[PDB]
Amino acid sequence: SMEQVAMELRLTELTRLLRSVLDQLQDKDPARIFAQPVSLKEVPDYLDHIKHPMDFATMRKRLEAQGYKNLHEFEEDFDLIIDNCMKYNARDTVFYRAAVRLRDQGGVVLRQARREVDSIG
Ligand SMILES: CS(=O)(=O)NC[C@@H]1CC(=O)N(C2CCCC2)C1
């Protein structure tokens, strides 16, 4: 139908916007701590602690499959990256501190993204 196609155009546009957001958020992780899944080979107990792992590469895979229907779904995954890290790692670690910095700097990006998704529709 024409309606289906119009919807898919919207989804494609959202994906375009979220691709820009994702690039901006990942730039706030210059250490690349969150670039890839936590290695279950190197951290074999990880899933005993963290029930829903997340990382930027996994987000990008879902993104390019147009798997984020709205900004809320995308933000949920971003929050998983940060929250998983701040639970597994103690406050005095480079990992926890990188997550705090990513959270703080990312808030600015996400605040304007929400306005853009709302504005453009
Ligand atoms: C690229 S990397 O920095 O080598 N690994 C990233 C993960 C993110 C995370 O929370 N990690 C903890 C460190 C203790 C075991 C799991 C390391």
Question: What distance in angstroms lies between residue 95's CA and the mean position of ligand 1's atoms?
Answer: 7
Q: Which amino acid is present at 39?
A: S
98, burial (CB in 10 Å: exposed 0-12, middle 13-18, buried 19+): buried
In the chain, the number of structural domains is 1
Work out whether the CA dihedral 37, 43, 44, 45 comes out positive or negative: negative
**The CATH number of the domain where 73 resides is what?**
1.20.920.10
**How far, in Å, CA of 74 to CA of 76, rounded?**
5
Mutate to test the pocket of ligand 1, among 32, 38, 40 (most ligand atoms within 8 A of CB): 38
Determined by which method?
A: X-ray
In angstroms, the first-to-last Cα distance of the chain is: 21
Query: Which residues, 6+ apart, have CB-to-CB distance to 107 below 8 Å?
Result: none
This PDB structure is determined at a resolution in Å of 1.5
Directed axis angle between helix 71-88 and helix 2-26, to 10°?
Answer: 30
